[PDB]
Design an enzyme around this catalytic site. Structure first.
Site, PDB file in Angstrom:
ATOM      1  N   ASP A  94      29.060  41.874  47.817  1.00 30.54           N
ATOM      2  CA  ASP A  94      30.343  41.281  48.193  1.00 30.54           C
ATOM      3  C   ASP A  94      30.199  40.551  49.526  1.00 30.54           C
ATOM      4  O   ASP A  94      30.260  41.176  50.590  1.00 30.54           O
ATOM      5  CB  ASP A  94      31.397  42.370  48.305  1.00 30.54           C
ATOM      6  CG  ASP A  94      32.750  41.832  48.690  1.00 30.54           C
ATOM      7  OD1 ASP A  94      32.928  40.597  48.654  1.00 30.54           O
ATOM      8  OD2 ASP A  94      33.630  42.661  49.034  1.00 30.54           O
TER       9      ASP A  94
ATOM     10  N   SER B 192      35.267  22.783  52.792  1.00 24.32           N
ATOM     11  CA  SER B 192      34.966  21.819  51.751  1.00 24.32           C
ATOM     12  C   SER B 192      35.566  20.468  52.109  1.00 24.32           C
ATOM     13  O   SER B 192      36.615  20.373  52.750  1.00 24.32           O
ATOM     14  CB  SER B 192      35.526  22.338  50.418  1.00 24.32           C
ATOM     15  OG  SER B 192      35.403  21.372  49.396  1.00 24.32           O
TER      16      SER B 192
END
Length: 330
Positions: free
Chosen positions: A35, A199
């Site tokens: 994770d 992004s």
């Protein structure tokens, strides 16, 4: 040193991925959910409340000659999905894919919430976010990657998650045969303890690319892709019959649909998520309403590049002095 381990979807939807981890002496092998959005290595154990164990493999520290109680240490964690766990702490030897750390903090669960009990395939979590998020008190502990870093050939790990197929976590090297083209690296902020990056934009299907900054986290422990409501609405508007359902808890779409791809920007590069990766199947057994793999982050407080996005790429988690993230197509 290096390590290399195969990671395997837990079910036919890729809801999560499990990777075998050796703990203790002699080894006890547990299948953990790696994770990158958390920083605790915790396991189902001989100490876990018996009614809360349902098929998981447990760590028994009393059977490990290298286990030592970390005196006074406790831990307690709550995840974005509302699940939680807590317990005490041992140090022990932990190996992943041939890479061994001695003295790793292994957090033994005394309590786990229902969603963990109900998932017999996940024996615990192995956190790979930054150690500043580790929950052990009163002495915060280091992640497996943090402990191994100095010994690794290169201070990196890579996630290569499969679509409906096994994949690989590598530590300490970049397998140049595992991706196509080049790896595009992008800046990371560690201020929230996550692999947080920006992004450069998105496209829906064959549509034009929209240049817009989207700050979010690379999180292998989250199944879906959570993005701003404007982006998610633009995506689902291209799917006939798709709608946001308050009763179901997100966007659903007719199971008869063919979904468009979704592209996200990494610098000047582009990662294409095929439409099929966005199909999470019937909302309930036999339903013709299917659950979408791209959902709004509006109620989360952060955008999350979860498995839906990451499994479309070969992803480098670069733990150099200034960390960065790398993405390549594959």
């Amino acid at each position: 040193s290096t390590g290399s381990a195969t990671t395997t979807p837990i079910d036919s939807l890729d809801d999560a991925y499990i990777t075998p981890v050796q703990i203790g002496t002699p080894a006890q092998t547990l299948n953990l959910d790696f994770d990158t959005g958390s920083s605790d290595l915790w396991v189902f154990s001989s100490e876990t409340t018996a009614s809360e164990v349902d098929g998981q493999t447990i760590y028994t520290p009393s059977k490990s000659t290298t286990a030592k109680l970390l005196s006074g240490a406790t831990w307690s964690i709550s995840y974005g999905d509302g699940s939680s766990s807590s317990g005490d702490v041992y140090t022990d030897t932990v190996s992943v894919g041939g890479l061994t750390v001695t003295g790793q903090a292994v957090e033994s669960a005394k309590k786990v919430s229902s969603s963990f009990t109900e998932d017999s395939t996940i024996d615990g979590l192995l956190g790979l976010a930054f150690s500043t998020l580790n929950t052990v008190s009163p002495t915060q502990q280091k992640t497996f990657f943090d402990n191994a870093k100095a010994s690794l050939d290169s201070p990196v790990f890579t996630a290569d998650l499969g679509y409906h197929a096994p994949g690989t976590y590598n530590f300490g090297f970049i397998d140049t045969t595992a991706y196509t083209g080049s790896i595009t690296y992008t800046a990371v902020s560690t201020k929230q303890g996550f692999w947080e990056w920006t992004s450069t934009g998105y496209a829906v299907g064959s549509g034009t690319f929209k240049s817009t900054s989207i700050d979010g986290i690379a999180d292998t422990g989250t199944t879906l892709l959570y993005l701003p409501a404007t982006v998610v609405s633009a995506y689902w508007a291209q799917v006939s019959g798709a709608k946001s359902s308050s009763s179901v808890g997100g966007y659903v779409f007719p199971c008869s649909a063919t979904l468009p791809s979704f592209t996200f920007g990494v610098g000047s590069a582009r990662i294409v998520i095929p439409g099929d990766y966005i199909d999470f199947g019937p909302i309930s057994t036999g339903s013709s309403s299917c659950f979408g793999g791209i959902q709004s982050s509006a109620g989360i407080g952060i955008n999350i590049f979860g498995d839906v996005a990451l499994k479309a790429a070969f992803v480098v988690f670069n733990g150099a002095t200034t960390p960065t993230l790398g993405f390549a197509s594959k």
